[PDB]
Amino acid sequence: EDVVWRWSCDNGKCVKLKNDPRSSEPALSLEACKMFCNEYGLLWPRPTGEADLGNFLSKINLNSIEVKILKKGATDDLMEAAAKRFKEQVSLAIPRGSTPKLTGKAVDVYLVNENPNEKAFSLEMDESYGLRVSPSGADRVNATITANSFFGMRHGLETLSQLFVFDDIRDHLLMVRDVNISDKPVYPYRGILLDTARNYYSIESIKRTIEAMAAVKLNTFHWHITDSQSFPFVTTKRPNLYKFGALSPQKVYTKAAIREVVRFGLERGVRVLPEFDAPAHVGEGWQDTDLTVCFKAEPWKSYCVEPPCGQLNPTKDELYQYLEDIYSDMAEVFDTTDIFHMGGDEVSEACWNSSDSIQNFMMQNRWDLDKESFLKLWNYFQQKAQDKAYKAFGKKLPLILWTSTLTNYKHIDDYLNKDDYIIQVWTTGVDPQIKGLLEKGYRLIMSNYDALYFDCGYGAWVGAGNNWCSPYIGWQKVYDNSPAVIALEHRDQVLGGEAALWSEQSDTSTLDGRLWPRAAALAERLWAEPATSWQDAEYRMLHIRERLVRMGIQAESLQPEWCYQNEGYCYS
Amino acid sequence: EDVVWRWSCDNGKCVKLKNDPRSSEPALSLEACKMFCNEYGLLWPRPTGEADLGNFLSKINLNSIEVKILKKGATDDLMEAAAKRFKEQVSLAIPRGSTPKLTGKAVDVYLVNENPNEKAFSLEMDESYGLRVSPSGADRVNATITANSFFGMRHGLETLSQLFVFDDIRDHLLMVRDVNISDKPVYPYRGILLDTARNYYSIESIKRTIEAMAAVKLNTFHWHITDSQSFPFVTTKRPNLYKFGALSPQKVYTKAAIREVVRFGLERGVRVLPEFDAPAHVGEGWQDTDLTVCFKAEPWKSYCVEPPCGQLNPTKDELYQYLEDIYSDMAEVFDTTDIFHMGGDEVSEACWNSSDSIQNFMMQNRWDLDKESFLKLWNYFQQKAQDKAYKAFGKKLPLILWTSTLTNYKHIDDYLNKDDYIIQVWTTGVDPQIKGLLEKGYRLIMSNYDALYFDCGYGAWVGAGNNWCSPYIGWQKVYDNSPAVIALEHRDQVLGGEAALWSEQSDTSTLDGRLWPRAAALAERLWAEPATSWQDAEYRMLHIRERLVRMGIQAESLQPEWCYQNEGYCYS
């Protein structure tokens, strides 16, 4: 029961051939052929600078890999954790059940962190690295990673682990012999949004998501932790919110659990960025406070875009005491984030107009009951909420809002400013709002729903048919979605992009399939911004999918495995 | 950290209410409310005969459930295995991490198998049962299941396990106190097709699928084991087919593994039905035999519907020796099946016309090179293959073919007969071929692609966009798809239906999500043929989804859990 086939490179395709015994030519395993037949080998994402993989592989001993930290600093614990994790990463080249022969060269990995004290997330942080692999003496390998920070160094270790291949014909662990790589991301913000309010996600599943993110150098986990459906965030200062708001007492995110996730992210170069969506998308947890209106309002279609309805009442002074406490509790445990997301999607005018206490407030303050004056109330809310957010984090920090009626570029400057507010765009990539916002100097996070809404395509969750943003977005479409094209000359104002997993129809059980391997397409787009299209990345995408599965990720299947074994035969 | 809410039934909806301490009314947990608020409680599928759940629940001791076989026979081992499995099923009412208080009544389960020797699968087999639950003495419960066979009895145990609810307010395991149920399926064939050739499925994942099938009384696993992409079936008599054909040496189905799956199915009332698709959908494994044509033919679009192309050469006498051996090896391990599927989908004329050996054969036998004469060659093939199939199984047994050019009702009688061939329909449910076939007396298995193709909706696997049969089919559409409506007066000729999971874009990792909970919608449709629509089953469907998750199935998420906790508020 040994493999019967071999592969040979022909016009950029590994063709399957019988491994006939009457041959003087050494047989190549599939992965070994791919490593040199493909322009970028088995790398994902492909590097942006030097990408020299040479021509040869060396047999290495799995048990003879040693990692050496050459520069000590404040990130010692992070560097040592990342180094310990390296052997585990390398074993990902080896299929489950297979065992490599413990023979071949020893590998010395040298880690050079040029600024070993630096460990803060920031939009200006340096994620660049240099990777060099060369033979050392007669019996070993020199792999040297040089980076300006821990984050660059961690990315370098990731790339390095991808330079190992398992020869399943011979049961040999192999490593690319001669490598020169220089690399750095095009965009500093490379994210996944996880909605953990429409359905609960086990913290195990959240950590697993972070593992897969780090594997493709995604660096931002946007945790949409509350909404109208539930409040799983454990607020120590306002405990009734999660007591009344959680789907169950166990379906909660404690301080200890969040600290665990935040640290797990930090070790892997992933910023854990919390969102408290306001003033819409609130409901459960707020019962008995009298601080919301329209909670469970019927008929819901008149009052909100999805059930249950519910909005904060900005006229209540006590509200901002609750908000200060929530933000403060968030700031305590989400202590690696440099940015705070404050939501601001889909505020309903009809909902605020239905409240008499709100109507009385506006009549006293000269404002009318027309659609324009409700923006004044929204501004009033956001200004006060902003103040509490700054107080909570103990500093002015960038804030994020969704595109909405408030962020309409024509009047956005009446309410916000470009220095204090980043706008997360979820309109189509062709919507006039994008160019308008960019011309007003605003910075953007791209999550255009026609390419980056990972929830689209499934059955309806209200009524029948399919969900609102169907059809399902294939990895080909997410790969080709280019912020550089969307933004043109104003592309430096694009901080990056984010795949959105809204969870009306997703939870613990479906997370792996929803995100992977599609988020890897976003990962390369944001890391490399290739001028080439999905077709040119197809073969490497099929491989990264297999790598996710080896990690224990229940990734979506893209193509028959036959296509992966027979490049060029599956096309349209 | 105890639940803060209670539920109360109002107009068929369990409404969430604060569990306020100043009340003399006992609080109901969510599931306890649902059990009596819903017409059919938490049952799935709902019974066809008597469905009397009474009004009350009794607290029971988990560790005091005893199952007693009252009639011994040849199915002793199956009955004892099913009985042992009962405690495990009951524990599925209890959420993970929660532990019930070991107090309350003892449960005596009495199993009455009226024909304890009967263990053969057949289209005429009796799957009916009676279920009665009543208090016994002052301290225990009498649950009696009466059935004409083991299969009916096993279904009865399944239904019985669904009559347990965990009260998470009090940590009590509860059981419906007074039950009278009589039940039997509308259709004898209730299936799932699993394609394990376009991608490999671990035998663990196949067994897990069978577990979930039995939970909703599905009884047929249609194993589409070979295709052009791979040959994972271990043929002892023709070992080169799997040696050359498998995706890897480990991606194989040995005799021992298949026997394991077949037995696992038998214990759970699931017929494991093998398909050897011929004469199209062959390729890998057949190299060096000269028994195929067009394998990997290019451009593939001219020769087949999907790559790789490949068809058997019916003019080679040696072919039928290979076929006899394959069928014989299949018959040896698939030894519970009463039916054999022989495929016959999508035979390409252009492919057969490209072969000179085939052309010479037809010219010698007076036949032309037109589209009509290729049906003569197909008939020639199928007649000889049929003979080998009968020889392999050692009896004339029903054979299945897909709808195709061959099975066109206008000429089907020239090639097949209604007694020997069951037709699996994968046309739309409105296609004229269905009425035509039924009027000619043919028996059908319904797998209409517009409602029962579970692979539809995802990205393209060749080129870009979405796959061929998109959009994604929601459970609402599979539920409402009625064979009774499709077939009208000829509905007794409908043997049932089958959800098809083709695997161009599915494997081990995605199996749970692809099948569940959608196949449960098919399960109720085929078991009960309700005159009511999906809306009336919505609440119970949300519950069965949760039950699959408790089983360890990574089932698709249908709706926010909030909707499940707040019936009636999520609608369109």
Ligand SMILES: CC(=O)N[C@H]1/C(=N/OC(=O)Nc2ccccc2)O[C@H](CO)[C@@H](O)[C@@H]1O
């Ligand atoms: C910013 C955002 O995406 N907001 C909501 C959101 N808003 O989009 C819509 O307004 N969708 C919609 C459009 C027409 C009809 C009904 C819903 O979509 C997500 C699901 O895709 C929800 O989870 C979000 O809460």
Ligand SMILES: CC(=O)N[C@H]1/C(=N/OC(=O)Nc2ccccc2)O[C@H](CO)[C@@H](O)[C@@H]1O
């Ligand atoms: C009986 C059957 O469904 N045959 C093939 C099959 N045939 O359907 C088509 O012909 N689809 C199609 C229609 C137009 C263009 C391209 C493919 O669909 C399945 C995938 O849904 C394949 O896995 C099957 O092998």
